Amino acid sequence: TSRHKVQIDMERQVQIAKDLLAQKKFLEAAKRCQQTLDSLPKDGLLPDPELFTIFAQAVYNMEVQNSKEEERLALHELANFSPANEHDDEIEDVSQLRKSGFHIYFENDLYENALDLLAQALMLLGRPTADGQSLTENSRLRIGDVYILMGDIEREAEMFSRAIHHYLKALGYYKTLKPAEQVTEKVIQAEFLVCDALRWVDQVPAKDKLKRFKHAKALLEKHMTTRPKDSELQQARLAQIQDDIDEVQENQQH
């Protein structure tokens, strides 16, 4: 069939785009994704979410080199440490997927563009499967990864409240994952990124900042007692969290 031929071509393009991104050839990886996306048939074949995620990374990094309200942080979100529940209102229906005109993502605001491309990655990864079962381990992992990327971009774009909210969403997704060394690394990473963004958000009271910082400090301290592979990175993170506590205790609280 055509469907198989198209499928195989798309998988090769993802690998090429992936390799181009690994080589730091960002315009080239993005163009590769864009042109592949524009030429896919519009009916009966869901594109590979990697086309969107690679495209988003590519365009984000291009901007770096060239330099509803539920998406904002709610204070109560910082006091939540639960895993992500069965439903996620931010995952759009696949009916809202862009089918053509992907050249639009080279225009205007590239940060905005990258985020919209990731919204579609989420849409694709989060699509409920026909078998009626719930999202797989791989999907939930990848969704977490997407939320971290969304957060990183929003942080870079100085949207710190949106950033923190997405880092917290990523953290919730990683917590649904079967425990493992790599899962623990991502959890710890997400906790730190929350704190790093949190230092720049003006509208969270000092008291709430301090409680989250101390939570993250305790977690990282506990992790360090296991003598993990990259102890110097974790030591660096821990040192930064202490700076965050100092900053708030001395300037912001009184």
From Swiss-Prot:
Keyword Phosphoprotein belongs to the record: yes
Tree of life domain: Eukaryota
Phenotype for R199A: Strongly reduces affinity for dimeric histone H2A and H2B
Signal peptide interval: none
Location in the cell: Nucleus
Phenotype when changing E156A: Strongly reduces affinity for dimeric histone H2A and H2B
A single GO molecular function term of this UniProt record: histone binding
Region (Interaction with dimeric histone H2A and H2B): 156-240
Record PTM Phosphoserine, positions in chain: S82
GO annotation terms (biological process): nucleosome assembly; subtelomeric heterochromatin formation
Effect noted on mutating E158A: Strongly reduces affinity for dimeric histone H2A and H2B
Primary localization: nucleus
Keyword DNA damage: no
Keywords carried by this UniProt record: Chromatin regulator, Nucleus, Phosphoprotein, Repeat, TPR repeat, Transcription, Transcription regulation
Family: Belongs to the NASP family.
Function: Histone H3 and H4 specific chaperone component of the nuclear histone acetyltransferase B (HAT-B) complex. Involved in chromatin assembly and telomere silencing.
Other remarks on this protein: Present with 4550 molecules/cell in log phase SD medium.
Subunit relationships: Homodimer. The homodimer interacts with a histone tetramer containing H3 and H4; the interaction is direct. The homodimer interacts with heterodimeric histone H2A and H2B; the interaction is direct. Component of the nuclear histone acetyltransferase B (HAT-B) complex composed of at least HAT1, HAT2 and HIF1. Does not interact with HAT1 in the absence of HAT2. Interacts with histones H3 and H4 in a HAT1/HAT2 dependent manner.
Domain notes: The N-terminal TPR repeat region contains an acidic patch that is important for interaction with histones. A C-terminal, highly polar region mediates interaction with dimeric histone H2A and H2B, but is not involved in interaction with heterotetrameric histone H3 and H4.
Protein name per its UniProtKB record: HAT1-interacting factor 1
